[PDB]
Amino acid sequence: SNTQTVLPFTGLNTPSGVAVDSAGTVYVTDHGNNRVVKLAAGSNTQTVLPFTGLNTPHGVAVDSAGTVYVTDHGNNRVVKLAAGSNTQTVLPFTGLNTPSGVAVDSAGTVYVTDHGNNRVVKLAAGSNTQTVLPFTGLNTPHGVAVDSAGTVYVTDHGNNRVVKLAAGSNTQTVLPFTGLNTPSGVAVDSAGTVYVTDHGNNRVVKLAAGSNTQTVLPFTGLNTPHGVAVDSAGTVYVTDHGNNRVVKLAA
Ligand SMILES: [Cl-]
Ligand SMILES: [Cl-]
Ligand SMILES: [Cl-]
Ligand SMILES: [Cl-]
Ligand SMILES: [Cl-]
Ligand SMILES: [Cl-]
């Protein structure tokens, strides 16, 4: 698990968000090219998802049914496409400003870092009443992940930290990472290990739940890791923004 592979995407331009579904399909926001692409496990040829009207897709998430959710940064909205659909829908968030990260929990609740408005919002599936999560002291939430229990993890880009808030709680905590610099992407695996792209320091780090010892993942040749996803096998996928590529490391 010290051997990185470059995924056989083509034509990427500063990729930003990455997500992986239960079948191992990898989804990437091709942020410089105004499109979202996917690659099935074992395929060497990507496909372009049929989103339309985008103005810079920035983050991506996928739920257990294969529905794909994308932050449309320049349109202040989150769009979704069901598996097998050519008809996108717009989630009824309101008042967003350059949304960046998106996550979806097992109940279908969608969480977005409303990055221009210094807040994190969520919308239960079928709701049109969003809730602002009670994080405090943020300086630009950038990425978001949510674990199996509904605990929410956010990269606080301007405070060089990752904050955590359990469902129902009003009291966040700060995870004991060391020496982060403008962290961007965050992911959490089924063991509760938290993975962060330390975007200002050219590295990807992880922290097991309850640990104070972070480990630096053995990626090589990075030029700004920007987003991170982790599959059910513990394989880690990272957008290497300055190399126009997506790399992965098996557990
Ligand atoms: Cl960016
Ligand atoms: Cl951007
Ligand atoms: Cl940005
Ligand atoms: Cl930012
Ligand atoms: Cl950024
Ligand atoms: Cl960047």
**How far apart, in Å, are the Cα atoms of 187 and each of 22, 94, 126, 127, 128?**
15, 25, 25, 25, 26
* Resolution for the entry shown, Å: 1.1
Evaluate whether 226 touches 239 at the Cβ level (below 8 Å).
yes
Rounded to an integer, what distance in angstroms lies between the CA atom of residue 227 and that of residue 213?
22
Pairing of strands 152-156, 245-249: unpaired
The count of other CB atoms within 10 Å of the CB of residue 66 is 16
Strand order in the sheet with 77-81: 57-62, 68-72, 77-81, 89-90
Q: How far is the CA of 97 from the centre of ligand 5 (A)?
A: 15
Tokens of 76: 């202040």
Evaluate whether 78 touches 110 at the Cβ level (below 8 Å).
yes
Q: How far is the CA of 147 from the centre of ligand 5 (A)?
A: 24
The pocket of ion ligand 2, defined by CB under 5 A, consists of: 73
Q: How far is the CA of 210 from the centre of ligand 3 (A)?
A: 30
Task: Give 44's Cβ-side CA count (13 Å radius).
Answer: 0
Q: How far is the CA of 8 from the centre of ligand 6 (A)?
A: 22
**Domain extents for the chain?**
2-251
> Which ligand places an atom closest to the C-alpha of 239?
6
Pairing of strands 173-174, 161-165: antiparallel
Evaluate whether 214 touches 207 at the Cβ level (below 8 Å).
yes
Nearest to 143 by CA among 208, 99, 202: 99
Rounded to an integer, what distance in angstroms lies between the CA atom of residue 168 and that of residue 170?
7
Tokens of 164: 């955590």
Q: How far is the CA of 201 from the centre of ligand 5 (A)?
A: 13
> Which ligand places an atom closest to the C-alpha of 156?
4
Rounded to an integer, what distance in angstroms lies between the CA atom of residue 91 and that of residue 188?
24
The superfamily CATH assigns to domain 2-251 is: TolB, C-terminal domain (2.120.10.30)
Q: How far is the CA of 74 from the centre of ligand 4 (A)?
A: 14
> Which ligand places an atom closest to the C-alpha of 56?
2
